[PDB]
Amino acid sequence: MEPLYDKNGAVLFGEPSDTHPQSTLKLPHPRGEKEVIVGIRDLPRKGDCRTGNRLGPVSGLFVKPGPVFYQDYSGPVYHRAPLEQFKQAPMCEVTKRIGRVTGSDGNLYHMYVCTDGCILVKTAKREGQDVLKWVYNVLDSPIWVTSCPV
Ligand SMILES: [Cl-]
Ligand SMILES: [O-]
């Protein structure tokens, strides 16, 4: 299975991998001051990275099925979408674009939230095009979707 990472970027099992250079996740980057859940209509907004906001600190954006969004998180996360837990699916109607995430296969994916609450990824590539939803979450851990810029 795809490895999890701790808040100092150390892998908790398996072997570590680098994120795609064009992902909205850029490492190394610190996180884990506080676990902070956010509503999707209340995602962290420009300048929140430096200062935090009324909800707490901001290390970027994390998400897991539910959907549950977080603006900071301290426990194990995915640095890449664990594609064994995703299933090929039709393009949904999307509520929001949330980032560009590295897949388990090393490829770049656009990540969206669908109106049905599903987290969906679609290959960034022009040729070869997969569309998937995050349907199992066996270790109950979010993907780190985007990191704050500094
Ligand atoms: Cl997995
Ligand atoms: O920001």
Numbering used by the authors: 21 to 170
What text does the study give?
Npro is a key effector protein of pestiviruses such as bovine viral diarrhea virus and abolishes host cell antiviral defense mechanisms. The nonstructural protein Npro (N-terminal protease) is the very first protein to be synthesized, releasing itself from the nascent polypeptide chain via a single, autoproteolytic cleavage event (Wiskerchen et al., 1991). Detached Npro is proteolytically inactive but acts as a viral immediate effector to modulate the host cell’s antiviral defenses (Ruggli et al., 2003). The overall structure revealed two compacted folding units: a protease domain (orange) and an interaction domain (I-domain, green).
In order to compare this postcleavage, product-like Npro with a precleavage, substrate-like variant, we produced an S169P mutant Δ(2–21)Npro S169P6His, as proline in P1′ was shown to prevent autoproteolysis (Achmüller et al., 2007). To elucidate the detailed mechanism of the single autoproteolytic cleavage, we determined the structures of Δ(2–21)Npro and Δ(2–21)Npro S169P6His to 1.5 Å and 2.0 Å resolution, respectively. We provide mechanistic insight into the proteolytic assembly by describing a substrate-like, unprocessed P1′-site reaction intermediate. Here, a solvent molecule trapped at the active site offers a consistent reaction mechanism highlighting distinct roles of the catalytic water. First, the solvent molecule reveals an untypically short bond distance to the Gly67 amide of 2.3 Å, indicative of a short strong hydrogen bond (SSHB, aka low-barrier hydrogen bond) typically ranging from 2.3 Å to 2.5 Å. Third, the positively charged side chains of Arg70 and Lys66 contribute to stabilize the hydroxide within the anion binding site. Several indications point to the existence of a hydroxide ion at the anion binding site. The geometric proximity of the activated water molecule to the scissile peptide bond suggests its relevance in catalysis. The substrate strand β4 with its P6–P1 residues is rigidly anchored to the edge strand β2 and His49 by a hydrogen bond network both before and after cleavage.
